[PDB]
Amino acid sequence: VGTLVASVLPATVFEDLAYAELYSDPPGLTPLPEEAPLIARSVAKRRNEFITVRHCARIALDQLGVPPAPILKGDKGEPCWPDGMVGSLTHCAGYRGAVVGRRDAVRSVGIDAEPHDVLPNGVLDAISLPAERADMPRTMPAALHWDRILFCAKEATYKAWFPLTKRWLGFEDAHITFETDSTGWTGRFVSRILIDGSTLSGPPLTTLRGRWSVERGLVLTAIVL
Numbered sequence: 001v002g003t004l005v006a007s008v009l010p011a012t013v014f015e016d017l018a019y020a021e022l023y024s025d026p027p028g029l030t031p032l033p034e035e036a037p038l039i040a041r042s043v044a045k046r047r048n049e050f051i052t053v054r055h056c057a058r059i060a061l062d063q064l065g066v067p068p069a070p071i072l073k074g075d076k077g078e079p080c081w082p083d084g085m086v087g088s089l090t091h092c093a094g095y096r097g098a099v100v101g102r103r104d105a106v107r108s109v110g111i112d113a114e115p116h117d118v119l120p121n122g123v124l125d126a127i128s129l130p131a132e133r134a135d136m137p138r139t140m141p142a143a144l145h146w147d148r149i150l151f152c153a154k155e156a157t158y159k160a161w162f163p164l165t166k167r168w169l170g171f172e173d174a175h176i177t178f179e180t181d182s183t184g185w186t187g188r189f190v191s192r193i194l195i196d197g198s199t200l201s202g203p204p205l206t207t208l209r210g211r212w213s214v215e216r217g218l219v220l221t222a223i224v225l
């Protein structure tokens with residue numbers, strides 16, 4: 001079983017998390033009939049990864065004692081987790097993953113996987129603030145593609161934020177600061193929210209702490225609130 005995503009999960013709430021990942025689409029996976037409408041008009045690549053990522057979601061939920069069931073799609077694409085559960089899903093070339101948590105210990109999860117590849121510069125200025133572009137090179141080893149790592153953290157931030165607020169969060173609306181561990185391939189980040197953080201219940205979101213990792217040609221990030 002693969003354990004790349006454990007490199008970005010916390011120990012403090014680990015017993016209330018579970019995860020499952022795969023690196024390709026198993027052949028011949030049939031969609032659940034209740035989930036098939038979600039991909040009824042989708043291209044084959046989207047259908048195949050959707051079915052794999054939902055499979056990972058149910059394996060991870062089963063570890064937390066949740067019986068397998070369909071996971072529908074809600075406001076703005078967000079997955080509809082079973083009662084008492086939270087989680088997040090991601091895919092990219094070579095990666096499909098789910099991390100889920102018990103809501104009584106975990107308020108929200110956001111994860112993202114990317115290929116550890118450059119982004120174009122025009123995609124970088126649209127996805128970053130000036131202070132990020134100044135500070136990332138100061139805090140990240142020169143071997144790493146900081147543009148891509150910053151973007152991966154932006155995506156995990158939106159996924160952790162949206163289920164709590166049900167509002168947009170733009171690339172300009174969170175300033176993310178990083179640190180690198182002395183081993184050079186993992187570290188921590190903090191996403192500072194620059195807009196109103198009001199949530200549907202509980203205290204407003206102001207800073208979201210996460211972890212990042214680069215390995216096996218992938219960037220992984222996770223935020224567990």
Ligand SMILES: CC(C)(COP(=O)(O)OP(=O)(O)OC[C@H]1O[C@@H](n2cnc3c(N)ncnc32)[C@H](O)[C@@H]1OP(=O)(O)O)[C@@H](O)C(=O)NCCC(=O)NCCS
Pocket residue numbers: 049050053075076077078079088089090091092111112113154155157158159160162163169170171172173174
């Ligand atoms: C929604 C988004 C973050 C998804 O990320 P992605 O890199 O395109 O794709 P991933 O495979 O990593 O993640 C897709 C999964 O995200 C989840 N997701 C989609 N919308 C979501 C939402 N509103 N809230 C939480 N999770 C959501 C879904 O599980 C989806 O997979 P599924 O359709 O198979 O269920 C991205 O497409 C997007 O729209 N980003 C713009 C918002 C943003 O990044 N703001 C910057 C904040 S600092």
Ligand code: NA
Pocket residue numbers: 014015016017063064
């Ligand atoms: Na457990």
Ligand code: NA
Pocket residue numbers: 021022023024
């Ligand atoms: Na695999």
Ligand code: NA
Pocket residue numbers: 070071072073080081
């Ligand atoms: Na559902």
Ligand code: NA
Pocket residue numbers: 078079081086087088163
């Ligand atoms: Na969610």
Ligand code: NA
Pocket residue numbers: 092093114115
């Ligand atoms: Na990809």
Ligand code: NA
Pocket residue numbers: 140141142
């Ligand atoms: Na360094």
Ligand code: NA
Pocket residue numbers: 175194
């Ligand atoms: Na600012």
Ligand code: NA
Pocket residue numbers: 175176177190191192
């Ligand atoms: Na910050």
Ligand code: NA
Pocket residue numbers: 135136139176177178179
């Ligand atoms: Na930084």
Ligand code: NA
Pocket residue numbers: 007185186213215
């Ligand atoms: Na590592």
